């Protein structure tokens, strides 16, 4: 169709207006005391939120060129939560600050390419300072604090996540579920979670992430490659007649006809899944045969006498829930007797002392923790579907953010980390005047989130920033501003801490999109109507 | 329908506006550090590209007369890529420079016909200098460098193409494929290449570049002309029952009824294709019979007693993929046992000694080279299917651009080749003042692409051009400006080289469309309701 | 330009070119956060040094040779 193209300064003017309109709506919700944003619900009562993520989800503009800026920042900010579980609003605030100051420097005659070089160097220094400042998570104290701050300062979810984390282990597996009961509880249902991919991307059931999730499924397990389709049809048809899903565990499947025909015949109905084996070697059977007996099923091959012509729906493995990722597979629960399952666990207990392969001993004591400690399923409960939907994604983000803290460390929150890291830019020096402007842009940007948090709470941002800088030398690096009550204190001791990945990714992501828009020279969009 | 006609200077004014809007959007992406262009994707996040080809594909204007100029330049610039792989953006930049300067000269009172004569005369001198400046490709070093520059300065794609080139030989055949694997790999399949194309024009399939592609076809080999369709039908119906396409290799097909009944009788089904039998003389059968056993089958002829009403599908030849051009055909690889196929290579190896005539002995040891070296399959992988489309196009073009370098040579890149060639115009002289203006138009145009590359990277174009002219005699002809790192160096040693076909075709194509629009006197277009 | 013409009668285009260069570069410095009053004080010090240097390069007019050369150049 016919398209209108905008060039040069006009193009960036459109982007700046779109980014500002997005950021001004979202930045008012930053911090623990963010202001209210009211969102229309047609034929319903307007929704009042202080979430930021909720506000950003609804923002879309009529002007295609202004919408270009809003969507670009939205995607980059959304990627921060997809990796770190937090920082969506912080990334948007940083993106606006860098872009607005970058345009000011260019308007004064500075070279846009040299500004990006200064921005790139400044971000690298800031990231390194964050690495030095972060400290590793030590135990339940910090994990609870991170989960509480990751959520909207609610200690109930923080306690549940901390209990769930210490149950399945510091680096175990946590999953989130729901129920009609108003109360929320943690159940340590036995399961496992290993890095296994699935055999064909056609097993998409509901998530848009091209992943698969199952409820009350039946498990087929094989010690070798998948057999012909006709051997599975008595199982494929009868179990569908029985009204339950299916999944096949085997080493490999041929993609010429077997992969396509299996899903094509079931594409119009509930569909089924198929997954790979973990690790390498014959000790796959140690995982495979255990999972077969821990889920009440069998491993099928013609060398064991289990003829494929006489398959009966009762050799299937049975479990509560199965979730399949792009590179990981986790199975929750089991319909067999737990005493016999735990009796069959004793084989894994004896496999601790009897196995002779290090590659399995590395995954041993994890086959027990996910079962003996159980895969942590959080059963979110609420009195209304709307609250259930809100709390459901609320818990997973807090769970994901907590896992990020363990992987990389924790840092004082409230924007103190970026303030401390920006102090290194005070001595970073370059030989190019324009690159120096790029460095000063990042220093100003790093000190914006703390000012916005103070402003939302009702305090002057620049007064708070100055005192936080002074307390960096008088008291310590971790001293900052507690916007919840309105006084200066040690942020780490108070428990106001953030995962260090959140701070690292947010500044890196924000500088990438801002630098992209600073050198955008043309916008191509269709003419409306 | 009713139409509106625009005459004279008004007509060229419409074209200039359309060409400028196209060129201004695309020229900002020229070079290794081109600026970003943001393209709207409805119901999706905007797409950011520095490609130029991607930008040009999306450009279309509402005004029918301005759209005339954009489409004319787009087609001519696109033909440059279709012939030499690269140079789409460079041709567009040159076209704008010639057209804009040509209009200026005409506005001063110069004769448009004499300007065109000067332009054609100047282009001929420039092309001759380009051939004089080019050097032949010597080995893997230049082949890898050309492929890297043809791609987006990615050494991974360059290495694979260089490895594929040396594996099959500089005159073999290469094709690009994809798989589920994220990583990309090179596959040498037991294939061959030939020099005879299709038998009917209806066999051309969907792909935009009109190169017909067939998947999982069966092969029929005939030693004489095709018999009536009534003998083919028992094969065709059974092959259709088998569910795979079928290919017929034969000498000729009757045009009275068979040329239509072959295609019309299958237009409603999976359809089939036929290909001319390659080779000449009695060695045609040697070209056929050896290939048939290389593809796991043998020839069939009604007059030999093998009636098509009784042939069996296992007796036919089978191959992975079959690729046919207008004047050429290739087979990717037979599906039979490789050990027997490699054993059957001895039967072609013995043809060095067991065959007398030297006419195909020139093609002998090349058919062996097509066998021993195989056919290169570039298995491209990407993190997502959308990125796979982006990467597949670039790799295919880089292969095509690399083959162009072998045919004609290489020249220093970065626009240095056109700068060096334009210096010969300083001494070219004509007796007509207006024809001298046309010569000076080409000289200015040839020095535009280097200035655009310098400007995109963040340097003054005229300052860079002036120093490159000085380095032409202080250091050497190959010295130019590197845009990846802002310093002057020898381009050939640095590996910043371009196929000399790309530079030759781009200037020739750009001057042709510019000359056409300079003397355009009327534009006829329908009234938009 | 008006003051230069009143005082010297020549160099008005050079003075206008110089004035734009000082103003354009001063805005760039101010946009980076520099104090406008200190920039003026720095500019004043530099001009004092520059004027002293120009007088060092000054050569007295020996006679008709320089008089003709000056008149020729100023008359384009
Ligand atoms: N009591 C507090 N005092 C000061 N800062 C706080 C306090 N509690 C949280 N913060 C900081 O406020 C920020 C969190 O606010 P929030 O609105 O969740 O921002 P976000 O995480 O970028 N957005 P979202 O993706 O919606 O969670 C972080 O920088 C926290 O460290
Ligand atoms: N490092 C470099 N320094 C200077 N010039 C370079 C460098 N790398 C590539 N070039 C030149 O830049 C041009 C390639 O840019 P590109 O944007 O691909 O132009 P194009 O090939 O005309 N367009 P497309 O068809 O989209 O690839 C050629 O003239 C190259 O010789
Ligand atoms: K908030
Ligand atoms: K480019
Ligand atoms: Mg948060
Ligand atoms: Mg190119
Ligand atoms: Mg004068």
Instruction: Give CA angle at B508 (B503, B511), nearest 5°.
Output: 125
Three-state secondary structure readout of A310-337: HCCCCCCEECCEEEECCCCEEEECCCCC
Of A445, A425, A442, give the one whose Cα is nearest residue A115.
A442
Experiment type:
cryo-EM
Chain C: closest CA distance from residue A522 (Å): 26
The answer to whether A307 faces chain B, any CB pair under 8 Å, is no
Distance CA B219, CA B447 (A): 54
Looking at the DSSP bridge assignments, the partners of residue B246 are: B218
Q: What is the greatest pairwise CA distance in chain C?
A: 53
Q: How far is CA B415 from the centre of its chain?
A: 21
Task: Compute the residue count for chain B.
Answer: 529
- Chains in contact with chain A (at least 3 beta-carbon pairs closer than 8 A): B, C
Q: What's phi and psi for A329, nearest 5 deg? A: -135, 130
Nearest to B482 by CA among B159, B29, B153: B153
Contact B499, B408 (CB under 8 A): yes
Instruction: Kindly give the pairing relationship between strand B213-215 and strand B321-324.
Output: antiparallel
**Secondary structure string (H, E, C) spanning B359-424:** CCCCCCCCHHHHHHCCEEEEEECCCCHHHHHHHHHHHHHHHHHHHHHHHHCEEECCCHHHHHHHHH
Angle between helices B140-150 and B155-168 (to 10 degrees): 140
Length reported for chain C: 76
Closest CA to A221 of A79, A334, A89, A55: A334
Give the list of residues 6+ apart from residue A521 with CB closer than 8 angstroms, or none.
A7, A8, A11, B28, B35, B36, B37
- Within 10 A of A113 (CB to CB), how many other CB atoms are there? 18
Q: Is B137:B143 a contact under the CB 8 Å cutoff? A: yes
Report the relative pairing of strands A299-300 and A218-222 from DSSP bridges.
parallel
Rounded Cα–Cα distance for residues A477 and B164 (Å) = 57
Ligand 3 centre distance from Cα of residue A180 (Å): 27
Pairing of strands B192-194, B479-482: unpaired
Cβ atoms of B145 and B497 closer than 8 Å: yes
Which of C29, C32, C33, C34 is the best mutation test for A, with the most CBs of A within 10 A? Answer: C32
Query: What separation, in Å, do the N-terminal and C-terminal C-alpha atoms of chain A show?
Result: 10
| Three-state SS at B31 | coil
Which DSSP state fits A37? Answer: E
Alpha carbons A354 and B398: distance in angstroms, whole number: 56
Closest Cα in chain C, distance from residue A66 (Å): 27
| Contact residues for C23 (Cβ-Cβ < 8 A; gap 6+) | none
DSSP tag of B86: S
C-alpha pair distances (Å), B208 with each of A509, B275, B394: 37, 21, 15
Burial of A482 (0-12, 13-18, 19+ CB in 10 A): middle
Q: Which residues pair with A299 in a beta bridge?
A: A221
CA distances from B415 to B150, B152, B205, B432 (A): 14, 17, 38, 29
Q: How far apart are CA B18 and CA B20, in angstroms?
A: 5
Residue of B nearest to A520 (CA): B36
d(CA C25, CA C21): 6
Helix (H, G, I), strand (E, B), or coil: what is residue A298?
Answer: coil
| Residue B165 burial (CB count, 10 A) | 23
How far apart are the CA of C5 and the nearest CA of chain A, in angstroms? 32
The CA-CA-CA angle for residues A199, A201, A203, to 5°, reads 85
Q: Which of B21, B36, B180 sits opposite A5 (nearest CB)?
A: B21
A487-490 and B246-250 strand pairing: unpaired
Residue A149: CB partners within 8 Å, gap ≥ 6? A413, A495, A496, A497, A498
3-state secondary structure at position B79: helix
Q: Residue length, chain A?
A: 529
Contact A181, A440 (CB under 8 A): no
CB pairs under 8 A between A and C: 12
Tell me the pairing of strands A47-49 and A37-39.
antiparallel
- Rounded to an integer, what distance in angstroms lies between the CA atom of residue C57 and that of residue C51? 10
Element (H, E) at B39: strand B36-39
Phi, psi values for residue B110, rounded to 5°: -70, 155
Q: Using only C-alpha atoms, what is the Rg of chain C? A: 17
Cα B164 to Cα B217, B375, B377, B379, B382: the distances in Å are 25, 9, 8, 11, 19
Q: Where are the alpha helices (DSSP H) in A364-446?
A: 366-372, 385-408, 416-422, 433-446
Residues A234-260: b if buried by 16+ CB within 10 A, e if exposed: ebbeebbeeebbbbbbbeebeeeebbe
CB atoms within 10 A of CB A282: 8
Contact A114 B48 (CB under 8 A): no
Characterize the bridge pairing of strands B246-250 and B410-412. unpaired
3-state secondary structure of B427: coil
Sheet strands side by side (includes B192-194): B192-194, B329-331, B321-324, B213-215
Quick one: A355 exposed, middle or buried, by C-beta within 10 A (0-12, 13-18, 19+)? middle
- Report the alpha-carbon distance of residue A381 to residue A35 in Å, rounded: 27
Exposure string over B227-258, b if 16+ CB within 10 A, otherwise e: beeeebeebbeebbeeeebbbbbbeebeeeeb
Distance from C-alpha of B108 to C-alpha of B437, rounded to nearest angstrom: 11
Q: What is d(CA A222, CA A275) in angstroms, rounded to the nearest whole number?
A: 11
Q: In terms of DSSP bridges, do strands B317-318 and B218-221 run parallel, antiparallel, or are they unpaired?
A: antiparallel
Contacts B60 to A, Cβ<8 Å: 1-3
Measure the CA–CA gap between B240 and B217, rounded to whole angstroms: 11
Is the dihedral angle over the CA atoms A127, A133, A136, A141 positive or is it negative? Answer: negative
Cβ proximity of A398 and A161 under 8 Å: yes
Listed residue (B246, B403, B352, B37) closest to A8, CA to CA? B37
Cα–Cα distances in angstroms (integers) from residue A47 to residues A27, A43, C57, in the given order: 18, 12, 78
Taking phi over 0 as left and psi of -120 to 50 as alpha, with beta for the rest, A374 belongs to: left
φ, ψ dihedrals at B466, nearest 5°: -65, -40
| Atom of ligand 2 lying closest to residue B414 CA | 5
- Mutual angle of helices A112-133 and A500-518, in 10-degree steps: 180
CB contact under 8 A, B36 and A516: yes
Q: Do A519 and B58 touch (CB under 8 A)?
A: no
Q: Which residues of C touch A440 (CB under 8 A)?
A: 32-33
Q: Please report, for residues A287, A347, A407, B268, the alpha-carbon distance to residue A368 in angstroms, rounded to integers and kept in the order given.
A: 11, 11, 22, 60
**Would you say A207 and A213 are in contact if contact means Cβ atoms under 8 Å apart?**
yes
The angle at the Cα of A142, spanning A139 to A147, to the nearest 5 degrees, equals 120
For residue B185, list its beta bridge partners.
B379
CA distance to A423, B176, B230, B289, B324, per residue, from B285 (Å): 81, 30, 25, 5, 19
Residues B197, B325: contact at Cβ < 8 Å?
yes
For A176-238, the three-class secondary structure string (H helix, E strand, C coil) is EEEECCCCCEEEEECEEEECCCECCCCCCCCCCCCCEEEECCEEEEECCCCCCHHHHHHHHHH
Asked whether A149 and A495 are in contact (CB, 8 A), the reply is yes
User: What Å resolution does this PDB entry report?
Assistant: 2.6
Q: How far away, in angstroms, is B76 Cα from ligand 2 center? A: 18
The strand pairing partners of B464, in sequence order, are none
CB-based contact B30:B152 (threshold 8 Å): no
* Residue ranges in B110-256 assigned as alpha helix (H): 112-133, 140-150, 155-168, 229-242
Question: Which residue from A37, A157, A414 has its CB within 8 A of the most atoms of ligand 1, so it is best to mutate?
Answer: A414
Question: Which of the 8 DSSP states describes residue A454?
Answer: H
Pairing of strands B246-250, B218-221: parallel
Query: For the packed helices A8-26 and A64-84, what is the interaxial angle rounded to 10 degrees?
Result: 50
**Radius of gyration of the CA atoms of chain A, in A:** 27
Q: Are residues A65 and A14 in contact, defined by beta-carbon separation less than 8 angstroms?
A: yes
Give dist(CA B352, CA B371) in Å, integer.
14
**Residues A510 and A95: beta-carbon distance below 8 Å:** yes
For chain C, helix, strand, coil in percent to 5 are 80, 0, 20
Q: Taking the CA atoms of chain B, what radius of gyration do you get in angstroms?
A: 27
Spell out a b/e string for B1-18, using b for 16 or more CB atoms within 10 Å of the CB, else e.
Answer: eeeeebeeeebbebbbbb
User: Which residues in C lie closer than 8 A to residue A114 (C-beta atoms)?
Assistant: none
A119-A120-A126-A127 Cα dihedral, nearest 10 degrees: 150
A357 three-state secondary structure = coil
Which ranges in B85-154 belong to alpha helices (H)? Answer: 88-107, 112-133, 140-150
Task: Yes or no: say if B19 and B69 are a contact pair by the CB < 8 Å rule.
Answer: yes
* Cα(A485)–Cα(A475) distance, integer angstroms: 19
């Amino acid at each position: 169709a016919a398209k209108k193209v905008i060039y040069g300064e006009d193009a960036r003017a459109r982007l700046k207006a779109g980014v500002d309109k997005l950021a001004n709506a979202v930045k008012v919700t930053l911090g623990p005391r963010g202001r209210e944003v009211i969102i229309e619900k047609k034929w319903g009562t307007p929704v009042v939120t202080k979430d930021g993520v909720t506000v950003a989800k609804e923002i879309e503009f009529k002007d295609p060129y202004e919408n270009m800026g809003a969507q670009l920042v939205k995607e980059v900010a959304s990627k921060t939560s997809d990796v770190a579980g937090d920082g969506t609003t912080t990334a948007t605030v940083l993106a606006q600050a860098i872009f607005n100051e970058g345009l000011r420097a260019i308007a004064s005659g500075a070279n846009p390419m040299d500004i990006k070089r200064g921005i790139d160097k400044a971000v690298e220094t800031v990231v390194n300072e964050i690495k030095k400042l972060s400290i590793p998570v030590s135990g339940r104290k910090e994990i609870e604090q991170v989960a509480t701050i990751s959520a909207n300062n609610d200690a109930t979810i923080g306690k549940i996540i901390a209990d769930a984390m210490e149950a399945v282990g510091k680096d175990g597996v946590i999953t989130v579920e729901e129920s009609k009961s108003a109360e929320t509880t943690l159940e340590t249902v036995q399961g496992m979670q290993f890095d296994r991919g699935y055999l064909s991307p056609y097993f998409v059931t509901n998530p848009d992430k091209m992943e698969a999730v199952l409820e009350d499924p039946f498990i087929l397990i094989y010690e070798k490659k998948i057999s012909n389709v006709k051997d599975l049809l008595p199982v494929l048809e009868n179990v569908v007649r029985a009204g339950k899903p299916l999944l096949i565990i085997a080493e490999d499947v041929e993609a010429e006809a077997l992969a396509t025909l299996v899903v094509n015949h079931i594409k119009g109905v509930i569909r089924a899944c198929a997954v790979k084996a973990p690790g390498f070697g014959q000790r796959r059977k140690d995982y495979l045969q255990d999972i077969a007996i821990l889920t009440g099923g069998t491993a099928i091959t013609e060398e064991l006498g289990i003829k494929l012509e006489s398959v009966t729906l009762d050799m299937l493995g049975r479990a509560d829930k199965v979730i399949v990722d792009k590179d990981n597979t986790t199975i929750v629960g089991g319909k067999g007797s737990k005493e016999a399952i735990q009796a069959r666990i004793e084989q894994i207990k004896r496999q601790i002392l009897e196995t002779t392969s290090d590659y399995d001993r590395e995954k041993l004591q994890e086959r027990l923790a996910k079962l003996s400690g159980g895969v942590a399923i959080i059963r979110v409960g609420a009195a209304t579907e709307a609250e259930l939907k809100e709390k459901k994604a609320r818990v997973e983000d807090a769970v994901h953010a907590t896992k990020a803290a363990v992987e990389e460390g924790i840092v004082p929150g409230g924007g103190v980390a970026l303030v401390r890291a920006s102090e290194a830019l005070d001595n970073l020096k370059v030989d190019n005047a324009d690159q120096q402007l790029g460095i000063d842009i990042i220093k100003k940007a790093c000190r914006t989130p703390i000012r916005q948090i103070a402003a939302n709470s009702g305090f002057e941002g620049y007064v708070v920033l100055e005192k936080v800088l002074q307390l960096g030398k008088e008291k310590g690096k971790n001293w900052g501003f507690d916007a919840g009550v309105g006084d200066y204190k040690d942020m780490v001791e108070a428990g106001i801490i953030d995962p260090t990945k959140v701070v690292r990714v947010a500044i890196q992501n924000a500088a990438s999109v801002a630098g992209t828009m600073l050198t955008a020279e043309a916008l191509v969009a269709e003419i409306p109507e």
